[PDB]
Design a protein around this nucleic acid. Structure first.
Ligand SMILES: [Mg+2]
Ligand SMILES: [Mg+2]
Ligand SMILES: [Mg+2]
Ligand SMILES: [Mg+2]
Lengths: 147, 205, 97
RNA sequence: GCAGAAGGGCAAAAGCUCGCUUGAUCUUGAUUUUCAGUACGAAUACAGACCGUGAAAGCGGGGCCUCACGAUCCUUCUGA
RNA sequence: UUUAAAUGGGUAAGAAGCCCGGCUCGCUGGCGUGGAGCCGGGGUGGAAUGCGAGUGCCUAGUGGGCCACUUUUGGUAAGC
RNA sequence: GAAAGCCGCCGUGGCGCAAUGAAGGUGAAGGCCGGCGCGCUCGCCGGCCGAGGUGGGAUCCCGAGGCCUCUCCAGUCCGCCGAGGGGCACCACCGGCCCGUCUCGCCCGCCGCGCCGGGGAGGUGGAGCACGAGCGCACGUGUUAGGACCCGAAAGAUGGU
RNA sequence: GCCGUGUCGGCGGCCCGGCGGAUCUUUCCCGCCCCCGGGGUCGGCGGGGGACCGUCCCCCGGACCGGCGACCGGCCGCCGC
RNA sequence: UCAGUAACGGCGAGUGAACAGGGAAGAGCCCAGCGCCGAAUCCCCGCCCCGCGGGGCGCGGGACAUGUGGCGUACGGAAGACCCGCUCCCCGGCGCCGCUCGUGGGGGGCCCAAGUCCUUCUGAUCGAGGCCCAGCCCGUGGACGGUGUGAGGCCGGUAGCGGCCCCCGGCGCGCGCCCGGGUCUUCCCGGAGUCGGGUUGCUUGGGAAUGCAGCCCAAAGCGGGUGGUAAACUCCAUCU
């Protein structure tokens, strides 16, 4: 849309949006991210702290599957199953607990986040944080680990 | 060259890049070229299906992906051995063979042995001149269609257990917890050392 | 009680016990071939990095006789398959006498 | 007179002399000083130990105060 | 330097203030002592003049200046 | 028509919904009432609830009172309304929670009693939570990598005449 | 003759509606493993039914305007020949 | 996609992979060596079989080759002797007859309808008109030239339209080769100046050397390679 952009409205002004004095040439501060410590220090400080140096252990050839663990915290603990069973199996004729597993829903770890409701469930995951299991064991549900 | 707050950028155009560029102005032309090589191939051969052989069921390599099922390469002989067909007979019947594939489970082995005989159940052959060595009558009353599509026996079938509902018992609601992992990990990095501290008690003499 | 982390990791599956592959058997001695290489160390002889190595092994040092093969054959674990069979041929040249 | 350059400041003292001594130590922050309201530097009040001195109140984390000093990366050491 | 202006700089001119009643504390400790915090209750008009304000985002240009009373430093002096 | 439409048991994946530590790893809920173990500054059981609280806070609600041709017999309405209420977003603040650490003190657990686990109270570091706002497309502006607004060297290198 | 959102009923087609649901179904259907030529579901598997929930399709009853959902006759008041 | 990520770098400027995972296509095999078969192997030469535009099995003569040709054989195991239960195939060509998939490919010549009336212009391809069938053809209104703007005047566009010629893959007589399968028994089982180490140059993201190359040292057989921090021990994983 060259009708809409700037250079039509500026076409006729001499210096073309760049000033008489400075007179925009090509590269007055060097090409790229030049001048890290020398003469653009105040730009790299105050907007990018931490850019200069080592911090940690080198780790040759990590493979992004060994440390793969997704998290459902307990807000989303009932989006896994249908709404059809969070009320149909909510009737305490006896301890009719539904199971909920997350490793068929693409999740490995169950973390904690507030308001697990008052239905006793059995929740299957490979890892439970100890706030999450004490929200399941304090609504009368059990927390069955699986692999 | 940088100004007020922004990303720091390493754009990889310092190298010469305008002499290797690849516009895909032929990717519609390459799609309807390789549909002619599926139209005029699947009709040219046979009532044999398109999309190749029967592939077996294969479970993925990454911890990330071991929970799922994939169309693998070939039934690795053993599945040709428990089901009992000859290996060089198998790849003209329409059964893929991958000899460098191993089986270190009995759970996964019978998961393809039933699959292979199920393929051999839904197979009909054409004997040459109708003396019929070990094929039945007229051609399964007819071939019923010309070609099959997108895989023989639907190689995904990512099935899952129902596991309907249960009563929480006494043992299940007291034990199996987070502290059963912190001591489980503590028998992973404090196990070899405790083999060595018991050698200290066998040299205490 | 399955668990994905710990000592007994992973999904509990049964294991197939089966005859190993035939490429897995590469360097068995296979008596026909031992007959060749025992016939050949009396028709050909030894090398001059091991004519000297036994005459340090029979007398002076066996650390240094290891440390002489260590320098002249590549690895340390190759030199514990030379030294303790240089000594064996020296044994059956000594204790067959 | 107070190590030295000046200026402020100092009297049963901040000077001299005697007696003891290691607060010139260990640790988190906040604040001031040129300041962009960034850093090093120096400095001010604190809080937690552990100590010294004094009969005691207290006073001390360097010199009566204002200067006396130095990043990344790398090397060296010390700590669980 | 005893003294010491003119011009000048900071704060203040209220309801976010005052007062009364009651609880808290692991601080302070002759002492319901001190001091903070929290809760409820009673009373608005608080120098003159003028005026609609607060608040965040992205940011171009610029980073050679010069002149004049006035006060001034170096200079014999200057359109220095 | 090198379009357009469809797939979803092609959502693999990308970015987002969870952060933090060098790392192993860990990983964001409170408020009240009853009561109890020596209510020890420390602590525990049953229920209701449920993102805590102070100050402002547009809007909305209640609203004493005021409003018409004779004085009583009344209605939806309208009109200002002193005070008072529920207070969106956002701002200042106090409180809590997660993780790294630091100091201080006891308590609890046992696929099996240890140079094991789990914990509590205060202080701090964090690109966090405290009822999510992102993704995709398009356009404008700004800043860079690209011959990069057009035109400009003294030079440098390779291969040749 | 109309259609909006509903209660039900006739489940009327569910076993000759459509589609879902990590609802429910070891008395159901074969091929498995476990157990001394056969059995015990003996627990689940791969497969294939049908019972049930939620939502849109014919009927009679019920709701209000009959609204761009319209034809009919009836009226007033136009208009043209 | 992983990912402008691990990693490299006066750790500055900047460069920067791979495995997972989803797709396109998916075809597998041969030998040396260890062994059995009395070289059962091949080339050239000459004759005739008899065939095209020629290539063959026959018939006789010179070579290669035992320093090792050909059959079976390849690490997924193989070979022989058993025993038992099934089966005689496949392979190319041949003049040819029938299909061809857009109905194969190539070539040439053909296939709808207005110049009818008025009118303007130098010229029409313009303007207007064609009763009630809408003047006419439309599977043909793409385009092009034609005295100017043309569905109809002409090439031609449309059509699983025809006919004509030449070549493609696939009938059936005369060719030519021609027993596999499961258990048990025994026997065989593998590539060296190569692998690796020391050093030196280049290179890479490869970082206590990833690859490459030189020079030196130079292997073993339960051996060897790899397992992304140098190393020793100890299991294991995978590969040959
Ligand atoms: Mg400029
Ligand atoms: Mg600009
Ligand atoms: Mg996009
Ligand atoms: Mg030159």
């Amino acid at each position: 849309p060259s009708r809409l952009r700037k250079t039509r409205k500026l076409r006729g002004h001499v210096s073309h949006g760049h000033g008489r004095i400075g007179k925009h040439r090509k590269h007055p501060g060097g090409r790229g991210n030049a001048g890290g410590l020398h003469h653009h220090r105040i730009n790299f400080d105050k907007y990018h702290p931490g850019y200069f140096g080592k911090v940690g252990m080198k780790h040759y050839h990590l493979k992004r599957n060994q440390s793969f663990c997704p998290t459902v915290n307990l807000d989303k603990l009932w989006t896994l199953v249908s709404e059809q069973t969070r009320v149909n199996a909510a009737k305490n004729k006896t301890g009719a607990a539904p199971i909920i597993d997350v490793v068929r829903s693409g999740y490995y770890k169950v973390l904690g986040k507030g308001k697990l409701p008052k239905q006793p469930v059995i929740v299957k995951a490979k890892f439970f944080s100890r706030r999450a299991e004490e929200k399941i064991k304090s609504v009368g549900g059990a927390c069955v680990l699986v692999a | 060259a940088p100004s007020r707050n922004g990303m720091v950028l390493k754009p990889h155009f310092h190298k010469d890049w305008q002499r290797r560029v690849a516009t895909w102005f032929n990717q519609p032309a390459r799609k309807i070229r390789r549909r002619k090589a599926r139209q005029a191939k699947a009709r040219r051969i046979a009532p044999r299906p398109a999309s190749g052989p029967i592939r077996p069921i294969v479970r993925c390599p990454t911890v990330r992906y071991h929970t799922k099922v994939r169309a693998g390469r070939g039934f690795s002989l053993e599945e040709l051995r428990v089901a009992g067909i000859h290996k060089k007979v198998a790849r003209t019947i329409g059964i893929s063979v991958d000899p460098r594939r191993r089986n270190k489970s009995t759970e996964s082995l019978q998961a393809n042995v039933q699959r292979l005989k199920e393929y051999r159940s839904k197979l009909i052959l054409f004997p040459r001149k109708p003396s019929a060595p070990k094929k039945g009558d007229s051609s399964a009353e007819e071939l019923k269609l010309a070609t099959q599509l997108t895989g023989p026996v639907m190689p995904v079938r990512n099935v899952y257990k129902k596991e309907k509902a249960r009563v929480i018992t006494e043992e299940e609601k007291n034990f199996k917890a987070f502290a059963s992992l912190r001591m489980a990990r503590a028998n992973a990095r404090l196990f070899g050392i405790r083999a060595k501290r018991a050698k200290e008690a066998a040299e205490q003499d | 009680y399955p668990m994905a982390v710990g000592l007994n990791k992973g999904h509990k599956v049964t294991k197939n016990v089966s005859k190993p592959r035939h490429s897995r058997r590469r360097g068995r001695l296979t008596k026909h071939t031992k007959f060749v290489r025992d016939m050949i160390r009396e028709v050909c002889g030894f090398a001059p990095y091991e004519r000297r190595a036994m005459e340090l092994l029979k007398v002076s040092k066996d650390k240094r006789a290891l440390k002489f093969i260590k320098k002249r054959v590549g690895t340390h674990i190759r030199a514990k398959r030379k030294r303790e069979e240089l000594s064996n041929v020296l044994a059956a040249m000594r204790k067959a006498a």
